[PDB]
Structures are given as C-alpha cells and as structure tokens.
C-alpha cells in the first residue's frame, strides 16, 4: 500500500482555517490513520513525532478534545483522510505528517507516512487567503 500527498506546501494567513489531506492508495486487513507534526528544529522530518497543539497521534486517530484546540481529524470512504486546523497562528508553521498503519490481524503490520509543509504568514508578503 502507498500514501499520496496531493499538496507538498500550504501557505496560509493567520486566523484562517486549513485542511491538510492524505490519500490511502490501495479479509482481516484494517487501516489505522492519524496525524502528527515534526519537531520545530533546523531540519523538519516525519521521523520526529510531536503532538499538534498538544494533541497526540493517539488523540487524533480515526473529537470534542480536538475541537477545544481548533482541530478536527476526519476521513472519506474513498481513502482520503484529513486534519482541519482552525484559527491559524505563525506558530502552526512546520512539517505535518499523516500516518497509516496496515494491520493484517496477528500476522503483519506495515506503516507508511506522508509529509507536507505548512507555512503561516503575517505582514506585507503574507498571502490574501489559504493558497
């Protein structure tokens, strides 16, 4: 199985709402999906796992707790899965990671992740709306 990331970079102004998305590309097989972010260091990588607005990859796995921090983890029937981040701040900038775990019950486990960069801007150079 593969994970597709339609967008590599998301450039948003502050106060806006953004939806980051990933696509799961295809008997006792089940898929577990979630999100996290890289650490805010010099090099951003999905091998680093940090919570998003203090919500862990366990908290965000596929509601009320996420809603309090302006987050919503959701999915489609067509492999698509996403995280909505409301009322964006400069601090939200960084590398975001969508994680998928394929479980063949008591037999095997395979894990794949996708990555996308989110840049939140303010001032003269900042874009008009999420684009």
């Amino acid at each position, epitope marked *: 199985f593969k994970v597709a990331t339609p967008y590599s970079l998301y450039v948003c102004p502050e106060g806006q709402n953004v939806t980051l998305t990933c696509r799961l590309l295809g008997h*006792d097989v*089940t898929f*577990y999906k*979630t999100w996290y972010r890289s650490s805010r260091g010099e090099v951003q990588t999905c091998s680093e*796992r940090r919570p998003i607005r203090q919500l*862990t*990859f*366990q*908290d965000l*796995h596929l509601h009320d707790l996420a809603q309090r921090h302006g987050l919503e983890s959701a999915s489609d029937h067509h492999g698509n899965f996403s995280i909505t981040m409301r009322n964006l701040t400069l601090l939200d900038s960084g590398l975001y990671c969508c994680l998928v*775990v394929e*479980i*063949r*019950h*008591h*037999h*095997s*486990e395979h*894990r794949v992740h996708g990555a996308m960069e989110l840049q939140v801007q303010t001032g003269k150079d900042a874009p008009s709306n999420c684009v």
Partner: antibody, heavy 123, light 108 residues
Framework: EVQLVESGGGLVQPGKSLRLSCAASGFTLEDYAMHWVRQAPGKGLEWVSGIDWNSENIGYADSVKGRFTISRDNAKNSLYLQMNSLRTEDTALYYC????????????????WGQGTMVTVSS | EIVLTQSPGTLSLSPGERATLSCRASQSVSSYLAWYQQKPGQAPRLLIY???SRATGIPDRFSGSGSGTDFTLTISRLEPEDFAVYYCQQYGSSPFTFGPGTKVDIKR
C-alpha cells in the same frame, strides 16, 4: 509472521538480579505502549509494569517499585525489565504484551503477547 | 488505587447457555475496562477493550457492557472451547491491576 520473542529468564538466587528482554518481529514497537504481565503457576494474572511509546509514562505494581525498572529501545524494537533484589514471591511466568494502557487507543483492537519466560527465584 | 472484584468465582454451564460475568471497581473507571480470556498453556487473549468494543477476530457471542463501577461480560451460546479463566482489568489509572478472574467450567 508477528511475534514477541522473550529471553533472559530462568533460575536466579534470591537477592540477585535478572534482565528480561522482549523483541518484536512482524511489527515495530515505536507507536505502542508495552507491558509486562506475570503469573505464578496456578494463579491469576498480575500486571507488573507498563511503558508508553516514548518512555514518558511508566507504571509499576507496588510490590516491584524500586526493585524493577522497565525500559525500551524502539530502534532495537525491544522492551526490557531489569529485576533487582529478586524474591521467591517473584517466581512466575513473565509475559510481555502489546495491550491497552498508556496506549491512548492506538491500537487497542490489536493485541500481541509473548510466549512467556519462566523466572524461578530459588537457592 | 482501583481494586477490581469479579463474580462468580466459578461458573459451571452446559454448552448453548448464556454466561454472565461481573466485574466491579472500588471507584468509577475513567470506561478504560478490558476483558481477557486465558485457556490452559496459553497467553491471555484480549476480548474486550473500552468496556464494550470487541478486539479484532473476537466472535459476536462475547459482549461487554456497563459503566462506572459495574461491568459485565456476556458469553452467549457457550461452547466447550470457551473453558477458560476470564479476567477484567482497568487500564486508565496506574497500577493497571487485573480482577481475580472467573473460571468458566463446561457441564457434560
């Protein structure tokens, strides 16, 4: 295909130490809380210790606090149990398990257990 | 600390009957309540997590219910292969101690 291989068990003199190890194949430990559960022959299950994925949250059964130390190495997909000041009461089959507790629901529907390793504390 | 009790200590039933197993907690459980089945010479198997959710591969005849301090495991259409000890365990507040188990015997 999927297994938790245990080792380091066996006969130990009372007051001495033993280090159990539990290594995963078929799946990676990096996302999961891991636990030690023991059972004296013909007795009930007894939770020994638990550790979350990033070694932040750690818990111990009262009777083993101070004497036993749970640790893990995600790069070696291994869970450890350093047992000091061993007593006859510690004689039991020790299981390592990928089960709920410090898991946050990830992934509670799927469990995995080691075959168990016997620890006998005797002179 | 949360202390769990289980009743009855032993249940002896004919196949096809319904087994009602009880788990009581000394205080309200967070629903981070699990049920395990253990057959002789084998590691325990998770049956129920979150008080009422079946683990992967668990048949529908095993059903978990209850909340707070009173939890139930119902095994309908009991089979001879269901001979085991059934343990409850809370995993929300450390130590994650197990209940003393209910031994289910088969009448024949």
């Amino acid at each position: 295909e999927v297994q938790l291989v245990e080792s380091g068990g066996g006969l130990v003199q009372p007051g001495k130490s033993l280090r159990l190890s539990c290594a995963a194949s078929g799946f990676t430990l990096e996302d999961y809380a891991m636990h030690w559960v023991r059972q004296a022959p013909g007795k009930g299950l007894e939770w020994v210790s638990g550790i979350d994925w990033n070694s932040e949250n750690i818990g111990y059964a009262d009777s083993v606090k101070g004497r036993f130390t749970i640790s893990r190495d995600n790069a070696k997909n291994s869970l450890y149990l350093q047992m000091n000041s061993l007593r006859t009461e510690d004689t039991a089959l020790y299981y390592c398990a990928k089960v709920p507790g410090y898991s946050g629901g990830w992934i509670d529907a799927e469990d995995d257990w080691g075959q168990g390793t016997m620890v006998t504390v005797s002179s | 600390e949360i202390v769990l009790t289980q009743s009855p200590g032993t249940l002896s039933l004919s196949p096809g009957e319904r087994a009602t197993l009880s788990c009581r907690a000394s205080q309200s459980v967070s629903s981070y309540l699990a049920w395990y089945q253990q057959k002789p010479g084998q590691a325990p198997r998770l049956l129920i997590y979150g008080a009422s959710s079946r683990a992967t591969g668990i048949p529908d005849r095993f059903s978990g219910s209850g909340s707070g301090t009173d939890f139930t495991l119902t095994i309908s259409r009991l089979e001879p292969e269901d001979f085991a000890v059934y343990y409850c365990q809370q995993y929300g507040s450390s130590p994650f101690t197990f209940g003393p188990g209910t031994k289910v015997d088969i009448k024949r």
